[PDB]
């Protein structure tokens, strides 16, 4: 009620009010949600007595879903329209076939609608009259939005009434253009993909926009690395030693992988290790010596990979975290005794260099400096920090809570479900309206969190396509806000600069497109839709052995595996009941795990679980190598979809 509609909202609403399928392109923070409110209200009130229509509203991430549902519920309570929502949260849900019919406004996540359409419970899209697509720029190759549109267009082009389509965006996306022409082509293809005739952008009331919406400012921070790293040097020495050990047993392995000049802390090295594994555990010999060599190479490569992960975490996260991870692996888990001696040799030196604060990670130093100086300048402010990986979320949480210098900070974690839950996310969000001052977020904090007060956005080695850049920068709804990209690589800065340009070129291309005459636009859109529909339509149309990946013991055969509930795999038979051994006090204790029978091979196959009445063990294809019963060939399967056999029920 207290919200007073501004002029530019009416301007944007106009074409949709008329009743054409439209796309709205506006800068972040202008209040496109209120525009959707007004369009929905005007469209619904238009119908005559005795006839009513439905409204559908999607969202990708759960917190966005929750806040949109709350906004709609608060706005439309007074008119008496009944709204509702569906999500993964609702358990034992009433069948949707009629919860669509009972209510007026329905909020969803597109996967639900796609599921129902594929199953067929919802007959056709004609039950609806208005479809609103938030963050509409994602309508592309296989995103669920595009599958919904595929159903829509396949229905329209062949032979019932169809609903109006409205899309909202803050950046339509440029794709991979190298010139204005390809940007124009990409935008035209996008508009065709969702059957829109009009693109609406505010121009008449621009000046009003400038003092209504404050554009955030951008900054870069390059941080150099240390020339001398004791931990890096000693771990690299361990790398050289372990590599020599691995080299000595094998006849050759320089030649096995085409990769060359492998650095130590690079992902290329990790790919090399994975390739050497997948090439060596598949290597066969004419027999116990074969298993022994396989075991030795497996252990060597596993420790190599674990140390490489420790190195990358060390160069990203703080000093202590890498040693924590390594010590946990060693303690939790012959040759392995030798390697344990090797690590325990250096442990104390590693701890000593870790507790020397002079060798602290420079990135953390500069991040402390930025937070300190900002919070000195403004005592009160709400800032968001963006990372790549949840492990880094936990690491930064601990490091922030453990710094006496940053007594100001009050942390709040935020991440996608699976793991924080839905009500926890809702509470953390609502608290910011409160005693929290900093929010550590993963990728879910894009596409609109709408915190009314945010003046600082920090990117911790977080870059990508232009869409992510714009959606990250836009989070600073509060005026005077700033964004800081912190990194230790110049190429990242270059990518950021070129992405800024790409944004500019897209913004010019859309203005060029707006000049085109109507009904030629629609004609070329129809042509593109027809061509793409033709392309898609014509686009598409035993008893083997399984053995332990580490000791090559004959685990089982696919003739004895019965799938339960189409989604779990198990095997019956006393023969399998000897080939493994459980653990007396399993590490989770929260149920007993499976392990290789021979004391030589401590390899985790699967886990126990109980179906309705029966306790049974289940295995993962990630544990075995498959071997033909006729020939001696082998492959490796990482995922049951690739494996092909006689899938048999319980």
């Amino acid at each position: 009620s207290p919200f007073k509609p501004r002029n530019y909202q009416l301007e944007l609403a106009l074409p949709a009010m008329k009743g054409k399928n439209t796309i709205i392109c506006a800068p972040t923070g202008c209040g496109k949600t209120f525009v959707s409110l007004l369009i929905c209200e005007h469209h619904l009130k238009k119908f005559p007595q005795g006839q009513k229509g439905k409204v559908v509203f999607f969202a990708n991430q759960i917190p966005v879903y929750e806040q949109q549902k709350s906004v709609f519920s608060k706005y439309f309570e007074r008119h008496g329209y009944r709204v509702t929502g569906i999500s993964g949260a609702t358990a034992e849900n009433v069948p949707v076939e009629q919860i669509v019919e009972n209510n007026d406004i329905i909020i969803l996540t597109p996967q639900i609608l796609v599921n129902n359409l594929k199953k067929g419970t919802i007959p056709s899209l004609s039950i609806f009259t208005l479809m609103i697509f938030d963050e509409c720029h994602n309508t592309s190759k296989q995103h669920p939005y595009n599958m919904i549109m595929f159903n829509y267009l396949d229905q329209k082009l062949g032979g019932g009434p169809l609903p109006q389509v409205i899309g909202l965006t803050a950046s339509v996306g440029v794709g991979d253009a190298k010139n204005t022409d390809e940007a124009l082509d990409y935008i035209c293809k996008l508009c065709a993909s969702l059957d829109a005739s009009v693109i609406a952008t505010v121009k008449h009331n621009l000046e009003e926009l400038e003092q209504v919406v404050y554009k955030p400012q951008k900054f870069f921070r390059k941080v150099e690395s240390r020339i001398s790293d004791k931990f890096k040097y000693i771990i690299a020495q361990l790398m050289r030693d372990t590599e020599s050990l691995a080299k000595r047993i094998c006849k050759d392995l320089e030649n096995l992988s085409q990769i060359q000049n492998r650095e130590f802390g690079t992902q290329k090295y990790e790919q090399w290790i994975v390739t050497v594994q997948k090439a060596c555990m598949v290597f066969q010999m004419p027999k116990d010596e074969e298993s022994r060599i396989c075991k030795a190479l497996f252990l060597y490569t596993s420790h190599l990979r674990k140390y490489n992960d420790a190195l990358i975490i060390s160069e990203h996260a703080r000093m202590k975290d890498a040693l924590d991870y390594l010590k946990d692996f060693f303690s939790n888990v012959e040759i392995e005794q030798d390697l344990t001696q090797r690590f325990e040799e250096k442990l104390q030196e590693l701890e000593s260099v870790s507790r020397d604060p002079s060798n602290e990670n420079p990135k953390l130093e500069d991040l402390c400096f930025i937070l300190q100086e900002e919070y000195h300048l403004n005592p009160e402010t709400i800032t968001i920090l963006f990372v790549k990986t949840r492990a880094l979320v936990d690491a930064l949480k601990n490091w922030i809570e453990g710094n006496p210098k940053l007594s100001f900070l009050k942390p709040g974690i935020l991440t996608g479900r699976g793991g924080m839950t839905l009500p926890a996310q809702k509470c953390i969000l609502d608290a910011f309206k409160g005693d929290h001052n900093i929010l550590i977020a993963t990728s879910v904090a894009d596409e609109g969190i709408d915190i009314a007060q945010c003046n600082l956005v920090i990117l911790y080695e977080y870059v990508g396509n232009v869409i992510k850049m714009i959606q990250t920068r836009g989070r600073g709804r509060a005026r005077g806000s700033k964004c800081f990209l912190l990194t230790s690589n110049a190429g990242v800065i270059e990518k950021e600069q070129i992405n800024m340009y790409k944004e500019k070129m897209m913004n010019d291309s859309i203005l060029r497109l707006q000049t085109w005459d109507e009904a030629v636009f629609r004609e070329k859109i129809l042509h593109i839709q027809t061509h793409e529909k033709f392309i898609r339509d014509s686009q598409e149309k035993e008893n083997k052995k399984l053995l332990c990946r580490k000791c090559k013991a004959l685990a089982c055969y696919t003739a004895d595996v019965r799938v339960i509930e189409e989604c779990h795999y198990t095997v019956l038979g006393d023969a399998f009941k000897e080939c493994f051994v459980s653990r007396p006090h399993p590490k989770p204790k929260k149920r007993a795990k499976i392990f290789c029978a021979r004391q030589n091979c401590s390899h985790d196959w699967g886990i126990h679980v109980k179906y309705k009445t029966f306790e049974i063990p289940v295995i993962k294809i990630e544990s075995f190598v498959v071997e033909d019963i006729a020939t001696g060939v082998q492959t490796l399967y990482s995922k049951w979809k690739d494996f092909h056999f006689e899938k048999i029920p319980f």
Binding site: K222, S358, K405
Partner: protein, 169 residues
């Protein structure tokens, strides 16, 4: 007459902040300046005058963003924020476009200008001035340990420099 002709010290310089060869200029560098790691290093964008003060006057200009000028003892914590600890008393032009004087936990807020500090430890009085001249907040503080002028500069606005101006009688 009581005025001294102070100069910066090169032992408490911040890696982000740079000093000229004449040591009469401080400024904010575009990129970090690698320096010796020491327990003395602030790890934050403030510096101290070289001269120790155990009847002395010295004045700085605020022309050319966000600044704090005051007095601090050597026994102050290096990582602590200027003007909020026990040993420090300063005046800062805060981000709300206001000038204020900060005491142990308190902040008395009151148009920026070129500032000056006149101290008399024998009388134990601290006076802040604006040259136009004008007067700022005056206090009665005397420290057992000899003090130094403490200057904090905004650490993210490149091209922002501070010069102590050397007037004569």
């Amino acid at each position: 007459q009581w005025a001294i002709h102070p100069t910066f010290n090169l032992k408490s310089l911040s890696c982000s902040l740079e000093v000229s060869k004449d040591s009469r200029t401080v400024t904010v560098s575009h990129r970090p300046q690698p320096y010796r790691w020491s327990c003395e290093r602030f790890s934050t964008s403030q510096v101290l005058c070289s001269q120790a003060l155990s009847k002395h006057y010295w004045e700085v200009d605020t022309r050319n963003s966000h600044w704090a000028v005051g007095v601090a003892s050597w026994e102050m914590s290096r990582d602590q924020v200027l003007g909020r600890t026990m040993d420090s008393c300063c005046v800062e032009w805060k981000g709300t476009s206001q000038l204020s004087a900060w005491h142990m936990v308190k902040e008395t807020v009151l148009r920026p200008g070129v500032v000056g500090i006149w101290l008399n430890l024998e009388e134990g009085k601290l006076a802040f001035y604006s040259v136009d001249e004008k007067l700022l907040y005056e206090c009665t503080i005397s420290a057992s340990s000899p003090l130094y002028p403490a200057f904090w500069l905004y650490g993210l606005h490149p091209g922002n420099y501070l010069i102590i101006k050397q007037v004569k009688v």
